Design a binder for this molecule. Sequence first.
Ligand SMILES: Nc1ncnc2c1ncn2[C@@H]1O[C@H](COP(=O)(O)OP(=O)(O)O)[C@@H](O)[C@H]1O
Ligand SMILES: Nc1ncnc2c1ncn2[C@@H]1O[C@H](COP(=O)(O)OP(=O)(O)O)[C@@H](O)[C@H]1O
Ligand SMILES: [Fe+3]
Ligand SMILES: [Fe+3]
Ligand SMILES: [Fe+3]
Ligand SMILES: [Fe+3]
Ligand SMILES: [Mg+2]
Ligand SMILES: [Mg+2]
Lengths: 194, 194
Amino acid sequence: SYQDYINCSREALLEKMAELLPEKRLTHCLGVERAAMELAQRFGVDVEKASLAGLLHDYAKKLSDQEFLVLIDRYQLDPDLKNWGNNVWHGMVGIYKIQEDLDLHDSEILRAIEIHTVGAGQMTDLDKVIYVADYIEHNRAFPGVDVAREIASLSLNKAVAYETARTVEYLAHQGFPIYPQTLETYNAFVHYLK
Amino acid sequence: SYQDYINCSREALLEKMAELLPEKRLTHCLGVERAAMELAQRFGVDVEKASLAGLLHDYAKKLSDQEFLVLIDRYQLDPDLKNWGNNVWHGMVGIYKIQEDLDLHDSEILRAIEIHTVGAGQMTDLDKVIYVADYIEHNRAFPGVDVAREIASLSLNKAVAYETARTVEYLAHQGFPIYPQTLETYNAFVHYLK
Ligand SMILES: Nc1ncnc2c1ncn2[C@@H]1O[C@H](COP(=O)(O)OP(=O)(O)O)[C@@H](O)[C@H]1O
Ligand SMILES: Nc1ncnc2c1ncn2[C@@H]1O[C@H](COP(=O)(O)OP(=O)(O)O)[C@@H](O)[C@H]1O
Ligand SMILES: [Fe+3]
Ligand SMILES: [Fe+3]
Ligand SMILES: [Fe+3]
Ligand SMILES: [Fe+3]
Ligand SMILES: [Mg+2]
Ligand SMILES: [Mg+2]
Protein backbone atom coordinates (compact mmCIF):
# COMPACT_ATOMS: atom_id res chain seq x y z
CA SER A 1 0.00 0.00 0.00
CA TYR A 2 1.07 3.65 -0.40
CA GLN A 3 1.47 4.05 3.39
CA ASP A 4 4.54 1.79 3.14
CA TYR A 5 6.28 4.87 1.67
CA ILE A 6 4.30 7.95 2.73
CA ASN A 7 2.47 9.17 5.83
CA CYS A 8 -1.14 8.71 4.62
CA SER A 9 -3.39 6.44 2.52
CA ARG A 10 -3.91 6.84 -1.22
CA GLU A 11 -7.44 8.19 -0.59
CA ALA A 12 -6.09 10.70 1.95
CA LEU A 13 -3.29 11.69 -0.45
CA LEU A 14 -5.82 12.31 -3.24
CA GLU A 15 -7.85 14.58 -0.94
CA LYS A 16 -4.73 16.60 -0.08
CA MET A 17 -3.62 16.81 -3.75
CA ALA A 18 -7.13 17.98 -4.72
CA GLU A 19 -6.51 21.09 -2.56
CA LEU A 20 -3.03 21.75 -4.01
CA LEU A 21 -3.68 21.16 -7.72
CA PRO A 22 -6.27 22.29 -10.28
CA GLU A 23 -8.58 19.54 -11.58
CA LYS A 24 -6.80 19.11 -14.93
CA ARG A 25 -3.43 18.63 -13.22
CA LEU A 26 -4.78 16.07 -10.72
CA THR A 27 -6.47 14.17 -13.58
CA HIS A 28 -3.08 14.17 -15.35
CA CYS A 29 -1.44 12.75 -12.20
CA LEU A 30 -4.07 9.98 -12.05
CA GLY A 31 -3.33 9.32 -15.74
CA VAL A 32 0.40 9.03 -15.01
CA GLU A 33 -0.32 6.72 -12.05
CA ARG A 34 -2.15 4.33 -14.42
CA ALA A 35 0.38 4.66 -17.27
CA ALA A 36 3.32 4.09 -14.91
CA MET A 37 1.68 0.88 -13.59
CA GLU A 38 1.25 -0.51 -17.14
CA LEU A 39 4.79 0.40 -18.22
CA ALA A 40 6.24 -1.06 -15.01
CA GLN A 41 4.40 -4.34 -15.64
CA ARG A 42 5.85 -4.39 -19.17
CA PHE A 43 9.47 -3.56 -18.30
CA GLY A 44 10.07 -5.26 -14.92
CA VAL A 45 9.72 -2.31 -12.55
CA ASP A 46 7.97 -2.53 -9.16
CA VAL A 47 4.38 -1.57 -10.05
CA GLU A 48 3.72 0.03 -6.66
CA LYS A 49 6.82 2.26 -6.70
CA ALA A 50 5.93 3.24 -10.27
CA SER A 51 2.27 4.02 -9.50
CA LEU A 52 3.14 6.14 -6.44
CA ALA A 53 5.91 8.01 -8.22
CA GLY A 54 3.54 8.54 -11.17
CA LEU A 55 0.80 9.95 -8.95
CA LEU A 56 3.27 12.22 -7.10
CA HIS A 57 5.43 13.40 -10.01
CA ASP A 58 3.68 16.80 -10.45
CA TYR A 59 2.82 17.30 -6.72
CA ALA A 60 4.81 20.56 -6.52
CA LYS A 61 3.62 21.92 -9.90
CA LYS A 62 1.86 24.90 -8.27
CA LEU A 63 4.45 26.03 -5.70
CA SER A 64 5.32 29.72 -6.07
CA ASP A 65 8.70 30.89 -7.38
CA GLN A 66 9.50 32.26 -3.90
CA GLU A 67 8.79 28.88 -2.32
CA PHE A 68 11.20 27.15 -4.73
CA LEU A 69 13.95 29.75 -4.10
CA VAL A 70 13.52 29.19 -0.35
CA LEU A 71 13.89 25.43 -0.91
CA ILE A 72 17.04 25.94 -3.00
CA ASP A 73 18.58 27.92 -0.10
CA ARG A 74 17.38 25.65 2.73
CA TYR A 75 18.65 22.47 1.04
CA GLN A 76 21.73 24.26 -0.37
CA LEU A 77 21.02 23.03 -3.87
CA ASP A 78 22.97 23.99 -6.99
CA PRO A 79 22.84 27.83 -7.01
CA ASP A 80 22.53 27.79 -10.84
CA LEU A 81 18.96 26.52 -10.23
CA LYS A 82 17.99 30.12 -9.35
CA ASN A 83 18.54 30.98 -13.05
CA TRP A 84 15.64 28.78 -14.18
CA GLY A 85 11.96 28.38 -13.27
CA ASN A 86 9.01 26.13 -12.55
CA ASN A 87 9.70 23.74 -15.49
CA VAL A 88 13.04 22.76 -13.94
CA TRP A 89 12.05 23.35 -10.29
CA HIS A 90 8.83 21.39 -9.83
CA GLY A 91 10.67 18.09 -10.13
CA MET A 92 14.31 18.91 -9.28
CA VAL A 93 13.42 21.07 -6.23
CA GLY A 94 9.81 19.92 -5.63
CA ILE A 95 10.98 16.56 -4.27
CA TYR A 96 11.98 18.33 -1.02
CA LYS A 97 8.44 19.64 -0.57
CA ILE A 98 7.02 16.18 -1.26
CA GLN A 99 9.48 14.83 1.33
CA GLU A 100 8.44 17.40 3.93
CA ASP A 101 4.67 16.97 3.39
CA LEU A 102 4.44 13.21 2.94
CA ASP A 103 7.53 11.87 4.79
CA LEU A 104 8.72 10.32 1.51
CA HIS A 105 12.28 9.02 1.91
CA ASP A 106 12.50 6.21 -0.65
CA SER A 107 15.54 7.13 -2.76
CA GLU A 108 14.33 5.41 -5.97
CA ILE A 109 10.89 7.08 -5.94
CA LEU A 110 12.47 10.45 -5.08
CA ARG A 111 14.96 10.21 -7.94
CA ALA A 112 12.24 9.27 -10.47
CA ILE A 113 10.21 12.35 -9.51
CA GLU A 114 13.35 14.55 -9.40
CA ILE A 115 14.29 13.99 -13.06
CA HIS A 116 10.82 13.39 -14.59
CA THR A 117 11.09 16.61 -16.64
CA VAL A 118 14.76 16.76 -17.68
CA GLY A 119 15.91 13.12 -17.39
CA ALA A 120 19.58 12.30 -16.90
CA GLY A 121 22.46 10.68 -18.80
CA GLN A 122 21.96 7.61 -16.58
CA MET A 123 18.39 6.62 -15.68
CA THR A 124 17.07 3.63 -13.73
CA ASP A 125 14.18 1.73 -15.27
CA LEU A 126 11.88 3.36 -12.70
CA ASP A 127 13.17 6.81 -13.78
CA LYS A 128 12.45 5.87 -17.41
CA VAL A 129 8.97 4.57 -16.60
CA ILE A 130 7.97 7.90 -14.95
CA TYR A 131 9.61 10.04 -17.65
CA VAL A 132 7.68 8.15 -20.34
CA ALA A 133 4.38 7.68 -18.45
CA ASP A 134 4.21 11.47 -18.03
CA TYR A 135 4.30 11.89 -21.81
CA ILE A 136 1.94 9.09 -22.88
CA GLU A 137 -0.79 9.10 -20.18
CA HIS A 138 -4.29 8.78 -21.65
CA ASN A 139 -5.33 12.44 -21.12
CA ARG A 140 -2.46 13.73 -23.34
CA ALA A 141 -3.52 14.60 -26.91
CA PHE A 142 -0.59 16.50 -28.53
CA PRO A 143 0.29 15.66 -32.17
CA GLY A 144 2.42 12.50 -32.32
CA VAL A 145 1.38 11.15 -28.91
CA ASP A 146 0.19 8.11 -30.93
CA VAL A 147 3.78 7.52 -32.11
CA ALA A 148 5.12 7.86 -28.54
CA ARG A 149 2.50 5.33 -27.38
CA GLU A 150 3.45 2.78 -30.06
CA ILE A 151 7.16 3.17 -29.25
CA ALA A 152 6.48 2.77 -25.49
CA SER A 153 4.65 -0.53 -26.14
CA LEU A 154 7.93 -1.95 -27.57
CA SER A 155 10.95 -0.23 -26.00
CA LEU A 156 11.37 1.88 -22.89
CA ASN A 157 14.75 3.22 -24.05
CA LYS A 158 13.45 4.18 -27.48
CA ALA A 159 10.48 5.92 -25.82
CA VAL A 160 12.87 7.98 -23.66
CA ALA A 161 14.90 8.81 -26.78
CA TYR A 162 11.81 9.84 -28.76
CA GLU A 163 10.32 12.01 -26.01
CA THR A 164 13.65 13.75 -25.39
CA ALA A 165 14.26 14.44 -29.08
CA ARG A 166 10.76 15.90 -29.49
CA THR A 167 11.21 18.06 -26.40
CA VAL A 168 14.56 19.46 -27.54
CA GLU A 169 13.08 20.05 -31.01
CA TYR A 170 10.02 21.81 -29.61
CA LEU A 171 11.92 24.00 -27.13
CA ALA A 172 14.22 25.19 -29.93
CA HIS A 173 11.18 25.67 -32.21
CA GLN A 174 9.56 27.90 -29.53
CA GLY A 175 12.84 29.70 -28.68
CA PHE A 176 12.86 28.64 -24.99
CA PRO A 177 16.06 28.07 -22.95
CA ILE A 178 16.99 24.38 -22.63
CA TYR A 179 18.16 23.16 -19.22
CA PRO A 180 21.52 21.50 -19.88
CA GLN A 181 20.63 18.23 -18.13
CA THR A 182 18.09 17.65 -20.91
CA LEU A 183 20.90 17.61 -23.46
CA GLU A 184 22.77 15.07 -21.34
CA THR A 185 19.69 12.83 -21.59
CA TYR A 186 19.30 13.56 -25.30
CA ASN A 187 22.89 12.65 -26.19
CA ALA A 188 22.82 9.53 -24.00
CA PHE A 189 19.60 8.18 -25.54
CA VAL A 190 19.46 9.46 -29.12
CA HIS A 191 21.21 6.30 -30.48
CA TYR A 192 18.06 4.27 -29.61
CA LEU A 193 16.14 6.01 -32.44
CA LYS A 194 18.15 4.02 -35.03
CA SER B 1 46.47 42.05 -48.00
CA TYR B 2 46.06 38.39 -46.97
CA GLN B 3 49.86 37.92 -46.75
CA ASP B 4 49.79 40.13 -43.64
CA TYR B 5 48.35 37.05 -41.87
CA ILE B 6 49.27 33.99 -43.95
CA ASN B 7 52.26 32.75 -45.95
CA CYS B 8 50.89 33.29 -49.48
CA SER B 9 48.73 35.63 -51.60
CA ARG B 10 44.96 35.29 -51.96
CA GLU B 11 45.41 33.99 -55.53
CA ALA B 12 47.97 31.42 -54.34
CA LEU B 13 45.68 30.41 -51.44
CA LEU B 14 42.77 29.88 -53.85
CA GLU B 15 44.93 27.61 -56.02
CA LYS B 16 45.91 25.53 -52.97
CA MET B 17 42.28 25.35 -51.70
CA ALA B 18 41.14 24.25 -55.17
CA GLU B 19 43.27 21.11 -54.71
CA LEU B 20 41.97 20.41 -51.17
CA LEU B 21 38.24 21.07 -51.65
CA PRO B 22 35.56 20.03 -54.13
CA GLU B 23 34.20 22.82 -56.33
CA LYS B 24 30.94 23.28 -54.39
CA ARG B 25 32.81 23.68 -51.10
CA LEU B 26 35.28 26.22 -52.53
CA THR B 27 32.38 28.20 -54.05
CA HIS B 28 30.77 28.17 -50.58
CA CYS B 29 34.01 29.51 -49.07
CA LEU B 30 34.08 32.32 -51.66
CA GLY B 31 30.44 33.02 -50.74
CA VAL B 32 31.35 33.25 -47.04
CA GLU B 33 34.32 35.52 -47.86
CA ARG B 34 31.90 37.97 -49.54
CA ALA B 35 29.16 37.65 -46.89
CA ALA B 36 31.67 38.14 -44.05
CA MET B 37 32.96 41.35 -45.70
CA GLU B 38 29.42 42.80 -45.94
CA LEU B 39 28.49 41.85 -42.37
CA ALA B 40 31.79 43.23 -41.05
CA GLN B 41 31.12 46.55 -42.81
CA ARG B 42 27.66 46.63 -41.20
CA PHE B 43 28.69 45.73 -37.63
CA GLY B 44 32.12 47.38 -37.16
CA VAL B 45 34.42 44.40 -37.68
CA ASP B 46 37.73 44.59 -39.57
CA VAL B 47 36.66 43.70 -43.14
CA GLU B 48 39.99 42.06 -43.97
CA LYS B 49 40.05 39.78 -40.91
CA ALA B 50 36.43 38.87 -41.65
CA SER B 51 37.02 38.14 -45.35
CA LEU B 52 40.09 35.96 -44.66
CA ALA B 53 38.40 34.07 -41.83
CA GLY B 54 35.34 33.63 -44.07
CA LEU B 55 37.41 32.22 -46.93
CA LEU B 56 39.33 29.88 -44.59
CA HIS B 57 36.51 28.72 -42.31
CA ASP B 58 35.94 25.35 -44.09
CA TYR B 59 39.61 24.81 -45.13
CA ALA B 60 39.85 21.51 -43.21
CA LYS B 61 36.39 20.22 -44.26
CA LYS B 62 37.90 17.25 -46.14
CA LEU B 63 40.56 16.04 -43.69
CA SER B 64 40.18 12.34 -42.86
CA ASP B 65 39.00 11.14 -39.44
CA GLN B 66 42.49 9.70 -38.82
CA GLU B 67 44.10 13.07 -39.55
CA PHE B 68 41.82 14.80 -37.01
CA LEU B 69 42.54 12.14 -34.33
CA VAL B 70 46.28 12.65 -34.93
CA LEU B 71 45.80 16.42 -34.48
CA ILE B 72 43.84 15.88 -31.24
CA ASP B 73 46.78 13.83 -29.86
CA ARG B 74 49.59 16.08 -31.17
CA TYR B 75 48.01 19.27 -29.77
CA GLN B 76 46.71 17.45 -26.65
CA LEU B 77 43.20 18.74 -27.18
CA ASP B 78 40.17 17.80 -25.10
CA PRO B 79 40.07 13.96 -25.29
CA ASP B 80 36.23 14.07 -25.42
CA LEU B 81 36.70 15.39 -28.99
CA LYS B 82 37.48 11.79 -30.06
CA ASN B 83 33.80 10.97 -29.36
CA TRP B 84 32.57 13.24 -32.16
CA GLY B 85 33.31 13.68 -35.87
CA ASN B 86 33.93 15.97 -38.82
CA ASN B 87 31.06 18.39 -37.95
CA VAL B 88 32.78 19.29 -34.68
CA TRP B 89 36.37 18.67 -35.84
CA HIS B 90 36.72 20.67 -39.05
CA GLY B 91 36.55 23.95 -37.15
CA MET B 92 37.55 23.05 -33.57
CA VAL B 93 40.53 20.87 -34.63
CA GLY B 94 40.98 22.06 -38.25
CA ILE B 95 42.44 25.38 -37.08
CA TYR B 96 45.71 23.55 -36.27
CA LYS B 97 45.98 22.28 -39.84
CA ILE B 98 45.28 25.78 -41.18
CA GLN B 99 48.00 27.05 -38.82
CA GLU B 100 50.51 24.45 -40.02
CA ASP B 101 49.80 24.95 -43.75
CA LEU B 102 49.39 28.73 -43.91
CA ASP B 103 51.41 29.99 -40.88
CA LEU B 104 48.22 31.57 -39.51
CA HIS B 105 48.80 32.80 -35.96
CA ASP B 106 46.29 35.65 -35.57
CA SER B 107 44.31 34.71 -32.45
CA GLU B 108 41.08 36.50 -33.50
CA ILE B 109 40.93 34.88 -36.96
CA LEU B 110 41.81 31.48 -35.47
CA ARG B 111 39.06 31.72 -32.85
CA ALA B 112 36.43 32.74 -35.43
CA ILE B 113 37.24 29.68 -37.55
CA GLU B 114 37.47 27.42 -34.45
CA ILE B 115 33.86 28.03 -33.33
CA HIS B 116 32.19 28.71 -36.72
CA THR B 117 30.09 25.52 -36.40
CA VAL B 118 29.23 25.33 -32.70
CA GLY B 119 29.62 28.94 -31.50
CA ALA B 120 30.29 29.69 -27.84
CA GLY B 121 28.56 31.30 -24.86
CA GLN B 122 30.81 34.33 -25.41
CA MET B 123 31.56 35.38 -29.00
CA THR B 124 33.49 38.35 -30.36
CA ASP B 125 31.84 40.32 -33.15
CA LEU B 126 34.28 38.69 -35.59
CA ASP B 127 33.20 35.24 -34.30
CA LYS B 128 29.57 36.25 -34.85
CA VAL B 129 30.23 37.58 -38.34
CA ILE B 130 31.78 34.25 -39.47
CA TYR B 131 29.13 32.13 -37.74
CA VAL B 132 26.38 34.09 -39.51
CA ALA B 133 28.12 34.58 -42.89
CA ASP B 134 28.47 30.79 -43.13
CA TYR B 135 24.69 30.42 -42.87
CA ILE B 136 23.56 33.28 -45.14
CA GLU B 137 26.13 33.27 -47.99
CA HIS B 138 24.51 33.67 -51.41
CA ASN B 139 24.93 30.02 -52.53
CA ARG B 140 22.82 28.72 -49.58
CA ALA B 141 19.19 27.92 -50.49
CA PHE B 142 17.68 26.00 -47.52
CA PRO B 143 14.10 26.88 -46.46
CA GLY B 144 14.10 30.00 -44.27
CA VAL B 145 17.48 31.32 -45.45
CA ASP B 146 15.46 34.41 -46.50
CA VAL B 147 14.46 34.96 -42.85
CA ALA B 148 18.08 34.55 -41.68
CA ARG B 149 19.16 37.10 -44.31
CA GLU B 150 16.56 39.67 -43.20
CA ILE B 151 17.54 39.21 -39.53
CA ALA B 152 21.26 39.56 -40.38
CA SER B 153 20.59 42.90 -42.14
CA LEU B 154 19.33 44.29 -38.77
CA SER B 155 21.01 42.50 -35.85
CA LEU B 156 24.10 40.33 -35.61
CA ASN B 157 23.08 38.96 -32.19
CA LYS B 158 19.58 38.08 -33.35
CA ALA B 159 21.07 36.35 -36.42
CA VAL B 160 23.31 34.22 -34.16
CA ALA B 161 20.27 33.41 -32.01
CA TYR B 162 18.13 32.46 -35.01
CA GLU B 163 20.78 30.28 -36.66
CA THR B 164 21.52 28.47 -33.40
CA ALA B 165 17.85 27.83 -32.63
CA ARG B 166 17.26 26.43 -36.13
CA THR B 167 20.33 24.22 -35.85
CA VAL B 168 19.33 22.78 -32.48
CA GLU B 169 15.78 22.27 -33.81
CA TYR B 170 17.01 20.53 -36.95
CA LEU B 171 19.54 18.28 -35.20
CA ALA B 172 16.83 17.09 -32.79
CA HIS B 173 14.40 16.70 -35.73
CA GLN B 174 16.96 14.45 -37.51
CA GLY B 175 17.94 12.59 -34.30
CA PHE B 176 21.65 13.59 -34.43
CA PRO B 177 23.84 14.08 -31.33
CA ILE B 178 24.26 17.75 -30.35
CA TYR B 179 27.74 18.89 -29.32
CA PRO B 180 27.26 20.51 -25.91
CA GLN B 181 29.02 23.77 -26.83
CA THR B 182 26.13 24.43 -29.23
CA LEU B 183 23.72 24.46 -26.31
CA GLU B 184 25.97 26.94 -24.50
CA THR B 185 25.61 29.24 -27.53
CA TYR B 186 21.87 28.57 -27.76
CA ASN B 187 21.16 29.43 -24.12
CA ALA B 188 23.40 32.52 -24.23
CA PHE B 189 21.74 33.94 -27.36
CA VAL B 190 18.13 32.72 -27.35
CA HIS B 191 16.90 35.87 -25.50
CA TYR B 192 17.67 37.94 -28.65
CA LEU B 193 14.72 36.28 -30.46
CA LYS B 194 12.25 38.28 -28.30
N1 LIG C 1 15.41 21.26 -20.57
C1 LIG C 1 14.29 21.95 -20.42
N2 LIG C 1 14.32 23.28 -20.24
C2 LIG C 1 13.19 24.00 -20.10
N3 LIG C 1 11.96 23.47 -20.12
C3 LIG C 1 11.83 22.12 -20.31
C4 LIG C 1 13.00 21.26 -20.47
N4 LIG C 1 12.57 20.00 -20.64
C5 LIG C 1 11.22 20.06 -20.59
N5 LIG C 1 10.79 21.31 -20.39
C6 LIG C 1 9.39 21.79 -20.28
O1 LIG C 1 8.89 21.76 -18.94
C7 LIG C 1 7.46 21.70 -18.98
C8 LIG C 1 7.01 20.68 -17.94
O2 LIG C 1 7.39 19.41 -18.45
P1 LIG C 1 7.06 18.03 -17.71
O3 LIG C 1 7.36 18.15 -16.24
O4 LIG C 1 7.77 16.96 -18.51
O5 LIG C 1 5.46 17.91 -17.96
P2 LIG C 1 4.22 18.46 -17.05
O6 LIG C 1 3.70 19.61 -17.89
O7 LIG C 1 3.21 17.34 -17.04
O8 LIG C 1 4.72 18.85 -15.66
C9 LIG C 1 7.07 21.36 -20.44
O9 LIG C 1 6.48 22.52 -21.04
C10 LIG C 1 8.39 21.00 -21.11
O10 LIG C 1 8.51 21.36 -22.50
N1 LIG D 1 26.30 20.86 -31.98
C1 LIG D 1 26.38 20.19 -33.11
N2 LIG D 1 26.54 18.85 -33.11
C2 LIG D 1 26.62 18.15 -34.26
N3 LIG D 1 26.55 18.70 -35.48
C3 LIG D 1 26.38 20.05 -35.58
C4 LIG D 1 26.28 20.90 -34.39
N4 LIG D 1 26.12 22.16 -34.80
C5 LIG D 1 26.10 22.13 -36.15
N5 LIG D 1 26.26 20.88 -36.60
C6 LIG D 1 26.30 20.42 -38.01
O1 LIG D 1 27.62 20.44 -38.57
C7 LIG D 1 27.50 20.53 -40.00
C8 LIG D 1 28.55 21.53 -40.48
O2 LIG D 1 28.07 22.81 -40.06
P1 LIG D 1 28.82 24.18 -40.40
O3 LIG D 1 30.30 24.03 -40.17
O4 LIG D 1 28.07 25.25 -39.64
O5 LIG D 1 28.50 24.33 -41.98
P2 LIG D 1 29.33 23.79 -43.27
O6 LIG D 1 28.46 22.66 -43.77
O7 LIG D 1 29.32 24.92 -44.27
O8 LIG D 1 30.74 23.37 -42.84
C9 LIG D 1 26.04 20.89 -40.31
O9 LIG D 1 25.39 19.75 -40.90
C10 LIG D 1 25.43 21.24 -38.96
O10 LIG D 1 24.04 20.90 -38.78
FE1 LIG E 1 6.10 17.72 -14.56
FE1 LIG F 1 3.39 15.63 -15.64
FE1 LIG G 1 31.93 24.46 -41.50
FE1 LIG H 1 30.75 26.60 -44.13
MG1 LIG I 1 8.48 14.02 -18.87
MG1 LIG J 1 27.78 28.19 -38.87
